[PDB]
Chain A
Amino acid sequence: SYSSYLAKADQKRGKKQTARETKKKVLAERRKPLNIDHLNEDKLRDKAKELWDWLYQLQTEKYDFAEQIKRKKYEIVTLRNRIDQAQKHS
């Protein structure tokens, strides 16, 4: 089975490269330049925090998505045991 090796390259490289740009496209949208530079002095104040919140915003979500996978990872472990237990080739 070595004629399938060319399938590995094509496949993997393909999917991986597809995923990349998508991530780039996506991430790019959610990005609005720090255009506001030297337009006011107290502006920075009302600005800086807004960025701060956005960060905290993202941070908090990342934490949740995280805890989520863990919980899901456990759903799996169990869902796998139910699969084996429910084997009985009898």
Chain B
Amino acid sequence: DEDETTALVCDNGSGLVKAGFAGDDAPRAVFPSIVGRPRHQGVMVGMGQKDSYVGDEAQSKRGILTLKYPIEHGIITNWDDMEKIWHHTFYNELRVAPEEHPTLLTEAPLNPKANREKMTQIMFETFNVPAMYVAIQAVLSLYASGRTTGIVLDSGDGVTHNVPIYEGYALPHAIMRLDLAGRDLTDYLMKILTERGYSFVTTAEREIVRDIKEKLCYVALDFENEMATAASSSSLEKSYELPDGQVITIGNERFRCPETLFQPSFIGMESAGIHETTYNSIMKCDIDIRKDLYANNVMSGGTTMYPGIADRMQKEITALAPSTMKIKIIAPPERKYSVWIGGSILASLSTFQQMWITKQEYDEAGPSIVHR
């Protein structure tokens, strides 16, 4: 129990932090990855002067603060502001003292060696956690779907990745990163919806375009004869009621937004798209492992939640793969937390105890120890 209860799992994202206790089924804490700094001197009624704001209080009060994102494209870019988000996570969100809890953290696919050593330096030397561990994100997603070999298409708020994993070892030279994700996708909907003849003028109009994207957006299979369908004008249309009455209608654009993930050309991106990239990762891997990867395309991440994403991907890679092959696109329902759940499982596991980096290992080996 000492640490059975006690292991923490913190998944640091570009848009959201997911956090909680190893053992739980889902994150106890989910909140924006921002750190707000007040543009002016003054106070809220009853509070003192605050130097900084994190998560939702930074989002809610955004009009008087300069908002900053510590993690650009999955990589920690500002370490002063990240130690601020961690502090908030332990002390306010989970309300635990960190110096008696083992902490499993996550990093990104080709996270620079030096960063994995730096967050270890900050975990052990400024938070004084007993022990910690850094798992790679795609690797926890895979594992949370039971398996050990497969290829994960991972897509969240600032990055998309393909991480081919074989008997647990993520394959460095076959990993692909596509910098277009849910953030890019909300801003494109924004324009095709203002372009539908609308105005997201106040900040209460801006924010909810993102809630339109999440609730009403679709990834149609045969996106071709779906536009064609749009035109005959079926009961395909969908009206959402705004903060007030102002019933906005979205028929068609509803799927023009996730067609951006297959066609980056919709947004002036010259890069290849999700399905081709799944494939290219795969023809960059060893030959003998390619049947395995093909029958185990695990999807994880908030942006892979658009319904019919899996069917489109299913047919997208069947028709690029040699017919002798078995294609299989696994997309679980909890996928917006796969990464986290994979960490919860792993860290609560009976056999993981012997991989925890302890302060004994650290004080004796330097940050190098956990770096592997």
A and B touch in the complex (CB under 8 A): no
Chain A residues proximal to chain B, CB less than 8 Å? none
